[PDB]
Design an enzyme around this catalytic site. Structure first.
Site, PDB file in Angstrom:
ATOM      1  N   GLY A  42       0.801  -1.209   0.000  1.00  0.00           N
ATOM      2  CA  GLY A  42       0.000   0.000   0.000  1.00  0.00           C
ATOM      3  C   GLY A  42       0.839   1.266   0.000  1.00  0.00           C
ATOM      4  O   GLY A  42       2.065   1.246   0.101  1.00  0.00           O
ATOM      5  N   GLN A  43       0.145   2.401  -0.112  1.00  0.00           N
ATOM      6  CA  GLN A  43       0.843   3.680  -0.194  1.00  0.00           C
ATOM      7  C   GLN A  43       1.659   3.949   1.066  1.00  0.00           C
ATOM      8  O   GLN A  43       2.820   4.367   0.989  1.00  0.00           O
ATOM      9  CB  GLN A  43      -0.147   4.817  -0.437  1.00  0.00           C
ATOM     10  N   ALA A  44       1.061   3.735   2.240  1.00  0.00           N
ATOM     11  CA  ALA A  44       1.788   3.967   3.484  1.00  0.00           C
ATOM     12  C   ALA A  44       2.987   3.036   3.592  1.00  0.00           C
ATOM     13  O   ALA A  44       4.098   3.469   3.920  1.00  0.00           O
ATOM     14  CB  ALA A  44       0.854   3.793   4.683  1.00  0.00           C
ATOM     15  N   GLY A  87      -5.982   1.808   4.821  1.00  0.00           N
ATOM     16  CA  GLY A  87      -6.097   1.674   3.383  1.00  0.00           C
ATOM     17  C   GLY A  87      -6.693   0.339   2.982  1.00  0.00           C
ATOM     18  O   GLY A  87      -6.605  -0.656   3.703  1.00  0.00           O
ATOM     19  N   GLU A 118      13.957 -13.455  18.313  1.00  0.00           N
ATOM     20  CA  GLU A 118      14.270 -12.842  19.597  1.00  0.00           C
ATOM     21  C   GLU A 118      13.260 -11.762  19.966  1.00  0.00           C
ATOM     22  O   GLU A 118      12.996 -11.541  21.154  1.00  0.00           O
ATOM     23  CB  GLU A 118      15.690 -12.276  19.569  1.00  0.00           C
ATOM     24  N   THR A 139      -5.706  -1.539   0.458  1.00  0.00           N
ATOM     25  CA  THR A 139      -4.618  -2.470   0.182  1.00  0.00           C
ATOM     26  C   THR A 139      -3.838  -2.793   1.451  1.00  0.00           C
ATOM     27  O   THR A 139      -3.572  -3.963   1.744  1.00  0.00           O
ATOM     28  CB  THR A 139      -3.682  -1.886  -0.876  1.00  0.00           C
TER      29      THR A 139
HETATM   30  N1  LIG Z   1       2.568   7.692   8.207  1.00  0.00           N
HETATM   31  C1  LIG Z   1       2.079   7.578   6.977  1.00  0.00           C
HETATM   32  N2  LIG Z   1       0.749   7.256   6.806  1.00  0.00           N
HETATM   33  C2  LIG Z   1       0.242   7.138   5.557  1.00  0.00           C
HETATM   34  C3  LIG Z   1       1.039   7.334   4.441  1.00  0.00           C
HETATM   35  N3  LIG Z   1       0.269   7.148   3.345  1.00  0.00           N
HETATM   36  C4  LIG Z   1      -0.987   6.840   3.744  1.00  0.00           C
HETATM   37  N4  LIG Z   1      -1.016   6.839   5.115  1.00  0.00           N
HETATM   38  C5  LIG Z   1      -2.165   6.538   5.985  1.00  0.00           C
HETATM   39  O1  LIG Z   1      -2.765   5.353   5.507  1.00  0.00           O
HETATM   40  C6  LIG Z   1      -4.175   5.460   5.529  1.00  0.00           C
HETATM   41  C7  LIG Z   1      -4.673   5.371   4.091  1.00  0.00           C
HETATM   42  O2  LIG Z   1      -4.290   4.138   3.531  1.00  0.00           O
HETATM   43  P1  LIG Z   1      -3.268   4.006   2.298  1.00  0.00           P
HETATM   44  O3  LIG Z   1      -2.037   3.237   2.727  1.00  0.00           O
HETATM   45  O4  LIG Z   1      -2.918   5.353   1.713  1.00  0.00           O
HETATM   46  O5  LIG Z   1      -4.136   3.160   1.235  1.00  0.00           O
HETATM   47  P2  LIG Z   1      -3.601   1.861   0.457  1.00  0.00           P
HETATM   48  O6  LIG Z   1      -2.851   0.916   1.365  1.00  0.00           O
HETATM   49  O7  LIG Z   1      -2.761   2.280  -0.719  1.00  0.00           O
HETATM   50  O8  LIG Z   1      -4.969   1.150  -0.022  1.00  0.00           O
HETATM   51  P3  LIG Z   1      -5.877   1.699  -1.243  1.00  0.00           P
HETATM   52  O9  LIG Z   1      -5.381   3.042  -1.738  1.00  0.00           O
HETATM   53  O10 LIG Z   1      -7.286   1.821  -0.716  1.00  0.00           O
HETATM   54  O11 LIG Z   1      -5.819   0.702  -2.377  1.00  0.00           O
HETATM   55  C8  LIG Z   1      -4.511   6.813   6.130  1.00  0.00           C
HETATM   56  O12 LIG Z   1      -4.761   6.664   7.510  1.00  0.00           O
HETATM   57  C9  LIG Z   1      -3.241   7.604   5.901  1.00  0.00           C
HETATM   58  O13 LIG Z   1      -3.063   8.616   6.857  1.00  0.00           O
HETATM   59  C10 LIG Z   1       2.380   7.656   4.605  1.00  0.00           C
HETATM   60  O14 LIG Z   1       3.104   7.829   3.620  1.00  0.00           O
HETATM   61  N5  LIG Z   1       2.893   7.777   5.880  1.00  0.00           N
HETATM   62 MG   LIG Z   2      -3.415   3.437  -2.249  1.00  0.00          MG
END
Ligand SMILES: Nc1nc2c(ncn2[C@@H]2O[C@H](COP(=O)(O)OP(=O)(O)OP(=O)(O)O)[C@@H](O)[C@H]2O)c(=O)[nH]1
Ligand SMILES: [Mg+2]
Ligand SMILES: Nc1ncnc2c1ncn2[C@@H]1O[C@H](COP(=O)(O)OP(=O)(O)CP(=O)(O)O)[C@@H](O)[C@H]1O
Ligand SMILES: Nc1nc2c(ncn2[C@@H]2O[C@H](COP(=O)(O)OP(=O)(O)O)[C@@H](O)[C@H]2O)c(=O)[nH]1
Ligand SMILES: [Mg+2]
Ligand SMILES: [Mg+2]
EC number: 3.6.5.-
Lengths: 441, 339, 419, 54
Positions: A10-12, A143, A254, A145
């Protein structure tokens, strides 16, 4: 030497993995092109850093990592960024359209069609390991994903790699930077199906990282870049023991042995100090006692909660920089008296201490100031249950009206999975209660 | 416009506080389960502290200190005093007490007991948590066995008011704000017994127990010497001058203030919200006993205390000024004593 | 590349659509001949969402123009940016729809729909990954209303897993062409309840009042009303057309705006109609800035999305936003935590240093459907003007069901307004 | 306050201080769950096309 494979979902997960591997290279002297002038074994060697980096015959040090996202925007910046030369195309996997913040879409609809490909690419990396320890999985809770595909992947990993530890770095949702309103649904859903497949998970609440960025770094409106460089500092100090010479947390197993006696209760609280703004020319260098004491201030924790009202099951101190054992022992003696640190009666009242002499590395042009000593405390306290309570309450408010449920049923998930997931969380909250807790006058 | 929520309908204090809040035009009451509040007047039991301080852009304040029960539960108070180095088992203003279950102190209690009735010394104890005052330890432990209880030495030499020859207790109201300032309400109350103190008959507990509960359902002289068996500081002070040639401040109030400071300072590291994502304040009801030597004894600490009907207006307004408006200002003269 | 296919049908649909492409073409730096003359890479970043690219780097709107008579189509082709559309994307007939839903949906419309779907199928074929469709039309006439909803039904049959969005202009007696508008609108609303994921309700009465009271226009025209709509359409699509993390694409916006499948009708708003952040925030939330002719104080917000454009204090935005809701907090449901989301775009709209667009899913929208229902029943109770529809093969039973369907919709909003 | 297991290397050291002693689904099962959900999606989409055919 035993290898660790990192998986960013996922993006995060992908953007946090970006900040980490950028930091890993700076810590190990690896240039963006993958060359490492300090590695005198060209295209080989089983040093500590080789747990995270393989070597080609040309001397390139390639991360043992696979990035996966159901939409290519975020992973396209990896392919085109500074460290593009680091990874090869096979380890960067992108889909066409994302999970629309829908757990059921990531786990069932889209996950069913891409899971076999992701496992195949992971097997390619596993085939390069003479003794694979396990996996480090980075992902968000909220998210589609990060929640949905992660839990499917974790299920398949337990199948294809039964005797391998799996650790998580999970981003807990915070409205201050939240995209979706359904993130409480996705958090509960992914925790339920992932719980029996994760040996140890480090939750990071974006609300905590956000405030630290505003309080300590003087950033009025932190961005994901600011948040992720701080997160990568904590992740780095957590994984430093795996890629540097040492004797504490040298193996993924560990982490479970030292931090998780009760299997379901595998969510340690992370506290990091010091976080100092780089815009401050000269800053008072904090002592061992001062930064150790800072590990017990709620404002430095990765999840806002009050450990003074929980019980500790295990506590681990990870120091980086100019630190020596007698300074740590003196600091602990001072803290064990003042602050209230109640351990469960069925666990020793002790601290495992690890010291890495290399001071924390800071990315040039970042917001964090170079410090001579830092510490990260991993403590498995029942206080982190406050995070489950909060999350479970937002879930209950929406689910009582079945709000947004049709989006999940529309992707083939059964409404029963909601309550099944919620009742597992209710039992998890009770597990914490059992281990922890003892008008008009 | 500040917002607050009410989760304790039974609180006579914060029912008035809520009434005063609305009477300013700058506070609005929300539904009990609305999370977008500035101030929570929380429930007495199981207040969800873990859900406070997580609303984006809301400074949230609650009228209870998480962890203050250690001081307001009879069982835990004993354990706190004996365990806390700040107080120690040598603490001279808390009656000798023991925690007895139906980790247990039932053994040590009988040890010090033998040393009393053997030495001719007055050996009367009071078990509580359903109160019983007995002369021999035999009848005491039987009452508890037949919830956890605490056996405490009974003050056999109480200060008796005249005329009447009757015992009493002193209630002091203490407000602790978010900065952990300790404020003692300048107005206390004496809950007096209307019956003469009898040193031999412990069966009748109308002249031994002074709380307003018993001094009404079973008090035979309710309201004779003072309206509602409640003597306030002005009258009591004038009495101490006439009868004993001393002042309430010197003979009693100094010890009361020292005891309040000792108890609250002791627990400050555990309950302070200085560096917390939310803020706390709380009103406390301290109950004191005075012996015939003019020594003050701590009886208990009440975490959700009621107030004297005659003092609601001043104290409740004082709470709004010191605890609420200090954090949420509006668009001297002071009724508290800062400790 | 997540492409959106745009369709505009009928007189109202094509006149509002034409202005929409005129506004955003200027924002993305596209001249009337499709050539790019911008000065910021942020313009071409997500240009392909709405534009195809041809040789010479000319950008062509992914737009299909539909009508049952040539008049409006000819006016667009001769319009300001008329040369920018693909010539073969004009699909029109000659008979007309006579402001009759039955003609657009069942008779005249049925003869043209297949050739419209041929064009739609061609635009979709050249899409890397089709997000979904957006339709502009009115509900009070014949082509946009009757044939527009026929098109939606056919599109859903062929692309069942794509998002379907519409900007729908609701009729009002104060800005009316024919007396049968409540009939046509009631019939269309049912089609939208079943087959759209997101519908922006644009009430012509609110547009008039805004031009009359706020904007101080003595005698507003359809042109003046269309100035407010295209500005609104540009704002609500800002997070689709430029780099964004919230409401990034159509399906993510739907997932976070629509808690119940049938309650997907949104009230849009705009401001200003330079300003400070508190001014934008206050104005954007006042009814006088909303275009559904519904007082939000009469209902409760299920979800809200706010888009701020220009260079402004990101802290002031949160403070004012968190302020405006934490004051009049009675108008937000308490069982959807954190149901007000805020996005910010750096590029301001033409002629403004900063603006704010408002998208609310409010139960107050039931007032709009109730108005239509009342006007429908006043005539239907006497079977007035029904012969125009029975002459096209429709039966009275179909009117009775559409009536009950919209009254069911109203009562559904009333349940969640009490909860 | 005992100190145990002191290990020292060139890049750091580790030890332990004790202040006081103490007082899955298979591959085919996952495949079924995925195909079950897919089946419910295809059923709902068949009812849609059936609805539209009417
Ligand atoms: N700390 C941090 N949080 C993130 C980041 N990107 C997204 N988030 C958090 O992740 C959540 C959104 O989910 P995402 O990870 O962006 O979505 P995804 O996993 O790509 O899933 P989909 O886009 O729905 O296919 C929100 O709570 C955001 O604040 C990041 O780069 N850093
Ligand atoms: Mg995404
Ligand atoms: N050790 C002791 N010696 C003498 N009297 C005592 C005593 N302990 C309690 N009492 C008497 O008991 C009465 C109240 O007892 P206690 O305060 O323990 O009960 P309680 O907690 O139910 C009162 P409240 O409801 O106000 O909290 C007082 O009036 C006091 O006179
Ligand atoms: N806002 C706006 N409304 C319009 C415009 N043209 C027509 N309408 C409204 O649309 C309805 C008439 O439908 P129309 O689009 O003309 O019929 P069609 O060509 O058969 O689709 C009436 O409610 C009109 O008030 C326009 O340019 N702008
Ligand atoms: Mg009591
Ligand atoms: Mg017309």
């Amino acid at each position: 030497m035993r290898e660790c494979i990192s998986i960013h979902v996922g993006q995060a997960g992908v953007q946090i993995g970006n900040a980490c591997w950028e930091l890993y290279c700076l810590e190990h002297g690896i240039q963006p092109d993958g060359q490492m002038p300090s590695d005198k074994t060209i295209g080989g060697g089983d040093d500590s850093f080789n747990t995270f980096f393989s070597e080609t015959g040309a001397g390139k040090h390639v991360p043992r990592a696979v990035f996966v996202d159901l939409e290519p925007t975020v992973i396209d910046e990896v392919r085109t960024g500074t460290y593009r030369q680091l990874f090869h195309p096979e380890q960067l996997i992108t889909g066409k359209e994302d999970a629309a913040n829908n757990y059921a879409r990531g786990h069932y609809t889209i996950g069913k069609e891409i899971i076999d490909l992701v496992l195949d690419r992971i097997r390619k990396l596993a085939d390069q390991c003479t003794g694979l320890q396990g996996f480090l999985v980075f992902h968000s809770f909220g998210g589609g994903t990060g929640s949905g595909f992660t839990s499917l992947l974790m299920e398949r990993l337990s199948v294809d790699y039964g005797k391998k530890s799996k650790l998580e770095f999970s981003i807990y949702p915070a409205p201050q930077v939240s995209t979706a309103v359904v993130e409480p649904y996705n958090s509960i859903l992914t925790t339920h199906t992932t719980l029996e497949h994760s040996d140890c998970a480090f939750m990071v609440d974006n609300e905590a990282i956000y405030d630290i960025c505003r309080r300590n770094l003087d950033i009025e409106r932190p961005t994901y870049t600011n948040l992720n460089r701080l997160i990568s500092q904590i992740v780095s100090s957590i994984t430093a023991s795996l890629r540097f010479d040492g004797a504490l947390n040298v193996d993924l197993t560990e982490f479970q042995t030292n931090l998780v006696p009760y299997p379901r209760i595998h969510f340690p609280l992370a506290t990091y100090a010091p976080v100092i703004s780089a815009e401050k020319a000269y800053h008072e260098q904090l002592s061992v006692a001062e930064i150790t004491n800072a590990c017990f201030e709620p404002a430095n924790q990765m999840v806002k909660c009050d450990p003074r009202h929980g019980k500790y099951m295990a506590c681990c101190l990870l120091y980086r920089g100019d630190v020596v054992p007698k300074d740590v022992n003196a600091a602990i003696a001072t803290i064990k008296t003042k602050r209230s640190i109640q351990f469960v009666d069925w666990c020793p009242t002790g601290f495992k201490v690890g010291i890495n002499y290399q001071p924390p590395t800071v990315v040039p042009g970042g917001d964090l100031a170079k410090v001579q000593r830092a510490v990260c405390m991993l403590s498995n306290t029942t206080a982190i249950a406050e995070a489950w309570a909060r999350l479970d309450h937002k879930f209950d408010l929406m689910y009582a009206k079945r709000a947004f449920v049709h989006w999940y049923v529309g992707e083939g998930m059964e409404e029963g999975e909601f309550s099944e997931a919620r009742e597992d969380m209710a039992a998890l909250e009770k597990d914490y209660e059992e281990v922890g807790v003892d008008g008009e006058e | 416009m500040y917002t607050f929520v009410v989760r304790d309908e039974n609180s006579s204090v914060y029912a008035e506080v809520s009434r005063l809040l609305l009477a300013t035009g700058q506070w609005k009451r929300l539904r009990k389960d609305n999370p977008r509040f500035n101030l929570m007047l929380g429930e007495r039991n199981r207040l969800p502290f873990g859900r406070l301080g997580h609303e984006p852009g809301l400074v949230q304040l609650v009228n209870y200190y998480r962890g203050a029960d250690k001081l307001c539960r009879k069982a835990s108070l004993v354990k706190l005093i004996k365990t806390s180095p700040e107080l120690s088992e040598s603490c001279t203003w808390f009656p000798e007490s023991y925690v007895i279950y139906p980790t247990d102190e039932r053994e040590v209690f009988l040890a010090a007991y033998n040393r009393r009735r053997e030495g001719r010394e007055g050996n009367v104890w009071i078990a509580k948590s359903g109160i019983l005052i007995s002369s021999e330890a035999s009848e005491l432990l039987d009452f508890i066995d037949e919830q956890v209880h605490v056996i405490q030495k009974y003050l056999e030499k109480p200060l008796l008011l005249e005329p009447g020859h009757r015992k009493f207790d002193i209630r002091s109201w203490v407000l602790v704000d978010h900065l952990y300032n300790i404020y003692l309400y300048r107005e206390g109350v004496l809950r007096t017994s209307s019956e003469p103190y009898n040193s031999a008959n412990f069966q009748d507990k109308t002249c031994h127990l002074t709380n307003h509960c018993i001094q009404k359902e079973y008090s035979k002289n309710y309201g004779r010497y003072e309206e509602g068996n409640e003597m306030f500081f002005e009258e009591f002070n004038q009495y101490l001058m006439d009868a004993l040639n001393t002042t309430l401040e010197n003979s009693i109030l100094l010890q009361i203030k020292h005891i309040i400071r000792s108890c609250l300072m002791c627990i400050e590291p555990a309950i302070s919200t200085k560096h917390l994502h939310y803020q706390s304040f709380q009103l406390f009801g301290f109950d004191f006993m005075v012996d015939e030597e003019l020594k003050v004894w701590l009886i208990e600490v009440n975490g959700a205390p009621a107030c004297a009907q005659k003092l609601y207006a001043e104290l409740c307004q004082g709470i709004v000024d010191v605890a609420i408006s200090s954090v949420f200002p509006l668009a001297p003269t002071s009724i508290f004593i800062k400790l | 590349m997540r492409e959106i296919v745009h369709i505009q049908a009928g007189q109202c649909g094509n006149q509002i659509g034409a202005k929409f492409w005129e506004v955003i073409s200027d924002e993305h730096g596209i001249d009337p001949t499709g050539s790019y003359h911008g000065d910021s890479d942020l313009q071409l970043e997500r240009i392909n969402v709405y534009y195809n690219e041809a040789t010479g780097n000319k950008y062509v709107p992914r737009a299909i123009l539909v009508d049952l008579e040539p008049g409006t189509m000819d006016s667009v082709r001769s319009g300001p940016f008329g040369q920018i559309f693909r010539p073969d994307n004009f699909v029109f007939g000659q008979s007309g729809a006579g402001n009759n839903w039955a003609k657009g949906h069942y008779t005249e419309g049925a003869e043209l729909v297949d050739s419209v779907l041929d064009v739609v199928r061609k635009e979709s074929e050249s899409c890397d990954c089709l997000q979904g469709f957006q339709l502009t039309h009115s509900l009070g006439g014949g082509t946009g209303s009757g044939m527009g909803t026929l098109l939606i039904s056919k599109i859903r049959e062929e692309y069942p897993d794509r998002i379907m969005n519409t900007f729908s202009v609701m009729p009002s007696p104060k800005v009316s062409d024919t007396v049968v508008e409540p009939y046509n609108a009631t019939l269309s609303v049912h089609q939208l309840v079943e087959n759209t994921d997101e519908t922006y309700c644009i009430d012509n009465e609110a547009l008039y009042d805004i031009c009359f009271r706020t904007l101080k226009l003595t005698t507003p025209t359809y042109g003046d009303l269309n100035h407010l709509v295209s500005a609104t359409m540009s704002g609500v699509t800002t997070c689709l057309r430029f780099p964004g993390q919230l409401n990034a694409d159509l399906r993510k916006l739907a997932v976070n705006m629509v808690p119940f499948p049938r309650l997907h009708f949104f009230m849009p708003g705009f401001a200003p109609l330079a300003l400070t952040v508190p001014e934008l925030t206050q104005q954007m939330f006042d009814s006088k800035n909303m275009m559904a002719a519904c007082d939000p104080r009469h209902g409760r917000y299920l979800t809200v999305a706010a888009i701020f454009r220009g260079r402004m204090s990101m802290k002031e935005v949160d403070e004012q936003m968190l302020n405006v809701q934490n004051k009049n907090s009675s108008y937000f449901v308490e069982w959807i935590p954190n149901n007000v989301k805020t996005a910010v775009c750096d590029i301001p709209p033409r002629g403004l240093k900063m603006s704010a667009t408002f998208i609310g899913n409010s139960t107050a929208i039931q007032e709009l459907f109730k108005r239509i229902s009342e006007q429908f029943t006043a005539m239907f109770r006497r079977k007035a003007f029904l012969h125009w529809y029975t002459g096209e093969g429709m039966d009275e039973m179909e009117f009775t069901e559409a009536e009950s369907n919209m009254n069911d919709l109203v009562s559904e909003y009333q349940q969640y307004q009490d909860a | 306050m005992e100190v145990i297991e002191l290990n020292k290397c060139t890049s750091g050291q580790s030890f332990e201080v004790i202040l006081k002693p103490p007082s899955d689904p298979s591959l085919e099962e996952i495949q079924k769950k995925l195909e079950a959900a897919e089946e419910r999606r295809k059923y709902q989409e068949a009812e849609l096309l059936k609805h539209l055919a009417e």
